[PDB]
Amino acid sequence: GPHSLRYFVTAVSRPGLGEPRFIAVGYVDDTQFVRFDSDADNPRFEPRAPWMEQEGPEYWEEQTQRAKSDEQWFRVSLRTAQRYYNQSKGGSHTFQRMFGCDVGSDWRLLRGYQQFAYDGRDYIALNEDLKTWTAADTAALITRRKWEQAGDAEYYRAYLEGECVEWLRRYLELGNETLLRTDSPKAHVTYHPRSQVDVTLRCWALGFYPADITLTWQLNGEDLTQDMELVETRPAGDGTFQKWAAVVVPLGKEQNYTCHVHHKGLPEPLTLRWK
């Protein structure tokens, strides 16, 4: 590996618009493979990767049933949290759920995640020991008492150790030709005449995977990653990503700056100079 399996579940209340919207997206590494959307026609988990369709109906049945369960679970938890905060009933609120798991190359659990957030803010989160809970406030404190009373930790701690992993190993095989791949980034530096003395140089990183990558500018050893114009790595749509960094520099000094690309697919970081 190392590899990871993640599910990002979202639930937002709709005051006077009917029941709340429940969305669930599942990922492996930086690739999306499953989804559930209450606002869809005939809600049910569906594959989003070609290699997921290689799964039987029973897999799909079960998955859907759980998503449907959590749809109820969230309607209530959302009404519950509403009271906890003494908020009014005509306001919409967001409840987020994160869970999944990181695995080492030994294919054994390495890190487990089960956390919650209300209205965009940390609410309650399992700790690394997988036996304790970290409540963000007094309201989340009554939730920890409940969840410990039911020994929920145990079950989740059990899920991460077994399920997510066993299934991760599987998803990885089914989608090996696209999950195991590594597309190196294709870099170049564009010249953009700024003023009469400056020029905006920009080196791009295209077609790479995993999403993780390092783009930097340097001036005679000097690291300028604070004076850089750096975007947030972005998806191209075909399963790979792009990104770029830009620096403003003087005329006739363009050659004095280098661009350094670091990625998993490159056996040795790239470097680029203009002219």
Binding site: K146, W147, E163
Partner: peptide, 9 residues
């Protein structure tokens, strides 16, 4: 594989 939440907040 998706996992159900258990107890409620």
């Amino acid at each position: 594989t998706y996992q159900r939440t258990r107890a409620l907040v």
